[PDB]
Symmetry: C3
Subunit: 481 residues, 3 copies
Amino acid sequence: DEARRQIVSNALISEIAGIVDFVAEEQITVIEQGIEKEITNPLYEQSSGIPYINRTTNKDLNSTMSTNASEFINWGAGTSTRIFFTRKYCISTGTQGNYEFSKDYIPCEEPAILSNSDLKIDRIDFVATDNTVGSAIERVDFILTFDKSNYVSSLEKAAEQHSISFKDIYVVERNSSGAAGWRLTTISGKPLTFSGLSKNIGSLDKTKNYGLRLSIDPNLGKFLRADGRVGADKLCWNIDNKMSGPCLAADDSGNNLVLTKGKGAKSNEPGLCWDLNTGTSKLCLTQIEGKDNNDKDASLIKLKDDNGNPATMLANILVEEKSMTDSTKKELRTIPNTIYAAFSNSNASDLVITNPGNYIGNVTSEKGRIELNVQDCPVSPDGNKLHPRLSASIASIVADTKDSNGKYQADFSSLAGNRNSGGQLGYLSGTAIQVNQSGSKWYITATMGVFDPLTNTTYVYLNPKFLSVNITTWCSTEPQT
Amino acid sequence: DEARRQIVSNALISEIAGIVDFVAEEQITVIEQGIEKEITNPLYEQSSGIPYINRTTNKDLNSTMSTNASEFINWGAGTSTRIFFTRKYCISTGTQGNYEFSKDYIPCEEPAILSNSDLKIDRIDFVATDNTVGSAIERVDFILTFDKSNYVSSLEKAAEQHSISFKDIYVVERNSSGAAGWRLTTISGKPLTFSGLSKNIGSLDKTKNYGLRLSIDPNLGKFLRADGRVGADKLCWNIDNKMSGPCLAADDSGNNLVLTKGKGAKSNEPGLCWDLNTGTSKLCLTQIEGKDNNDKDASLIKLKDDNGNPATMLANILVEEKSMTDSTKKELRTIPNTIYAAFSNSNASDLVITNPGNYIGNVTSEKGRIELNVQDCPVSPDGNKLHPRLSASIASIVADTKDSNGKYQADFSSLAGNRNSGGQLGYLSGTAIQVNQSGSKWYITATMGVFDPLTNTTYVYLNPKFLSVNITTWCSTEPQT
Amino acid sequence: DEARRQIVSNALISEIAGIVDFVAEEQITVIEQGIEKEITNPLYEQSSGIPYINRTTNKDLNSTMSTNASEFINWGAGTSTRIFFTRKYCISTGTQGNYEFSKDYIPCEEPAILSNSDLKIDRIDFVATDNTVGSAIERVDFILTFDKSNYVSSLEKAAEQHSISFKDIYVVERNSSGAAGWRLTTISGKPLTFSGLSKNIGSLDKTKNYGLRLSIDPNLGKFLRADGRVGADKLCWNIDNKMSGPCLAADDSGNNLVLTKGKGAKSNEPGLCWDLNTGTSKLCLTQIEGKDNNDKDASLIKLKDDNGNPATMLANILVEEKSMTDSTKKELRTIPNTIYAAFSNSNASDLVITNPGNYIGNVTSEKGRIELNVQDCPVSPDGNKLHPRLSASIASIVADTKDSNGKYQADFSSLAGNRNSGGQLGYLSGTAIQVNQSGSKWYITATMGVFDPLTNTTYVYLNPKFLSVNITTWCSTEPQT
């Protein structure tokens, strides 16, 4: 059953990857007196004891495997070896292991499936680069015992899922059941690699007990590469010769890189910054603490200079909110613009609608109208069509009437001078302000009703200079009238 | 001609860098069954054949060069060697090469200039670190044949443009024209490096054919450095022991770092995030799909929490848009503020302008005026001077008149209580609202015309408490009146 | 005194780290003809002279130390050695050193404290990996002379503050005062490491002069690691095989990562970008030059596409500014929304307030009112409670009166059709518009005063369809009325 073999293989590879990870750290983080401390890996201390100082010397894959139990490392049932590669406080009272690793390289408890699986790790060989005590390790060999090729495929699959690979795979054999009995299987004196196995399966003495030796190069993929072919678990930056700066790491989604504070931060406010190095502050997008509308803990981003003053972003902004009507639909809007403008009819012939009862509005063409180009809306997500919007609010309005010379003196075309001509005022009936649009233009027009008490005459004015408005323009998922 | 030699040198260095890149990848990406797969480089497989398993053993730069064609690799015209270092599908039907590399290390076709240039690669030596089959390679030597010092300068120039350097450069010679004939040129038994060449050019036997051996250390600059002195082509992050997270790489401008999704993303929405790790969501700036105003494909950035709700940025915002007037000029604006305020004249002596025909406005000093500090505008690009802006729109307005006690009861100073005092109302003539500014203050003032029908009296009021406005403030490249 | 010993140890470690940094750069940056140039470190040139080519060959920590002054490097007072590891232009006229390093590995002047401290560097051994001239260096040994264990603790403390560690520490001795006299102290022929020192202090011949040999592995922590355990000083990206792209480095706070332009940038506008790779522009947040409100040099961030057009961010925005009142307090606001709406009373029975003098407003329940859900405010920093805000500005208003059929024809419910029904207009007295709120609702109501000249009748209208408003909604630290 492939499924069964895959589960065994996944557990085997997890063990293998963890042991290799440990070998690949010459400096390790442990807990002493309740705090993290860097120490030399006991593997690489001249004064360490068994099993940390154990080395084999078969640098050539084809050379004789060690037969000496002080050189190879016995593994699995009946051995105590696991305690030296797992945390001291795997149990509350502490094991005989001397190191509280800050992380687990391998689980405290051996994976359950491996307690009686057909394939188990029987022995580990730390191949030394030289003959010194605590020597560097240039290869890690795992001898897997078969409890009597399908497995190689599932092992390779598990390996590729774990960012490791096998330097090679050899067939090994022993005459009995001892860890010291293992030796390379040979064909005419030539050690048998798995690649040569299909061809030579016929001459394989069935009296032997067989196994596989899996070789891992602990330095392969250990370092980040100029060509980018090795992934980073994280990357942290230095300050003053210490790894005290911010860190970047991926979350589980595959989309996000996450910035967190460095150990050197007196405050917890991670920031991504830009610097021109041309004499002014760098600008940072920084995460700071805040509170939500229910006074619950939250955070936000702040764009700031080094004095902590807000800085500027040039961008189109969309804001999303629940519709304030009975709708629970969400709506989008942009930042508005505001324009001050008066209508522009000035003389009686343009201003006065002489038969207002019969008059029909031609807003696209009326004299004195306010006309504007329809804005282009910015990009929106999905899903959500934005409409150009325009509103007009009254800014000044007077019931002007003809003066002695039959002229209208009130004029609101310039906000700074609206009071400058008082006008001859009648009684206001009010104003109707209409906004219309084509595909490309906004049309804003207005009528005003005025009673002239001097002549007892009722007037309707079209687009008068003595009516001005503040025009608001924006884009929204909420449509225009 | 330098220009000619530089072009040859650029092509030579490109070939060299590509071969070295290949050597420096023990694990490579190939295409099999239409998909990318990681395999061991055939250079480092015990079962590979010629030319992948070819090694020389001259680790010392001064030791004898190989004379054995199964050790060195013959290169160039008359050899088939290029097919093993180029893609199988360099031609549609496939070459005899067995590997479809996912990328080209060197071009399918040898650079045209090198077909008959004065300087060509004649032979390549993969110097083995040990005597095993598929041994690691600690040096790559390129023997360049001269078809009869200027070139060394252009070679070094080309090398520096390609992030590689020469471990050393030796003069080599042969008596005839065979690739196996090359040997180190010597001066009194001492192999001649290019640095020693100027001094010893005189004793150089003119009967020989000469060449240069260029040595490259494939591990030099291979890995990213703690001190930052090696550039990254890209950097990708891991998830669960796989290189499945997001990637960062530069675009061609030299200004931009670009974030793209990882192979593990179920969606394509790359994000840069901040995390306080204090119990609430991380915040992400994420790129999502959208549509532009013409319904064409586009994208945008979304600041969101892990529930996908928009999050908050504290910042000054500038928005750019085409002027909605006939101008095609672009304009900038900021986010406005809104303020509710009533004018504040309450009693008759302050309110009534007794000789309105003669009265001249003193807006900087008039009682009841609305006065505000002029805002500071944020930073703007270039190029684009921002002006403080202010507008006022009518929020409530009534034609109040004196009551029995000669008082004005209408009062709009508090929006929540505007209807609370009805007032004794006359007929409205309207209002003129003016906005003025000094360098530091905004002045908002107003006159209102009212006819009192009870006493048949016409009034002009100054800055009345029964006129209120919504004041909008913002900054813009569009100037104030 | 610990404090004294710590200061000596800090200076010793600084010297050590700098020398090791130099050893760890095979390619170095120097200044020649006024510009930065990469060259091979003189340590690794076959043609270099003393002291660069000096090597010892004791690869085994326990093997005999060199006695040859052309192998070890004499250090300190009486030697000239420092000039070869410091900049040529440590003095203006230039030293006899041949290299202007672009950075100082160690200070021009030896740290003052080390001129007569009890512990000094007496000698340095560059342990060669092989027997070639300019060989790579696999270990750097520093022999520290005691001028007659406390120091080991302070040395280790200084080392951990500098991202370096000791491979080991040995006790050494000499019979006299010569740099060539040093040898490993032994106990029964076994070289004495510091770890064994406590046990064996008793048999230590007091006639000798003692010292400590500190061994550093120059490759330990040299490269960035897949597991993220080595910090980066900086990281720069490549373009076209050159380290020409942008760089990231931490500032001194521990919170910030800073992006700066690459050497390949023709402009100085560093950007962080997102790319979907789905056929449209990548989006970049780019830093550009600008000017502040006083026309002083500044910068800002611009969100743009590859054509340089502003792009879109979906987010909640907070803007901070000084209160424009006498307050110097800062205030926060959000981006407003705008809504056009008319009140909705249409027939006389709803519209006319028949006894307006006695009528009390019931705004939560009045017919024709405008009612909206109160918005939720976004997250705010600290510190700063946001309030929902709402204002209303007049958009159209007419003094409508009953027609022949006793109906009111004026209707502003649709902005695009406000002029469509003219109405029968009286004289406007004005309008009082009130805004109130519960915890969950906004209530907007209005009264209008109108005089009907046809019937000489004075009217007060409630929430009339011939009054419309533009409603602005936003959140602010400035409270609502």
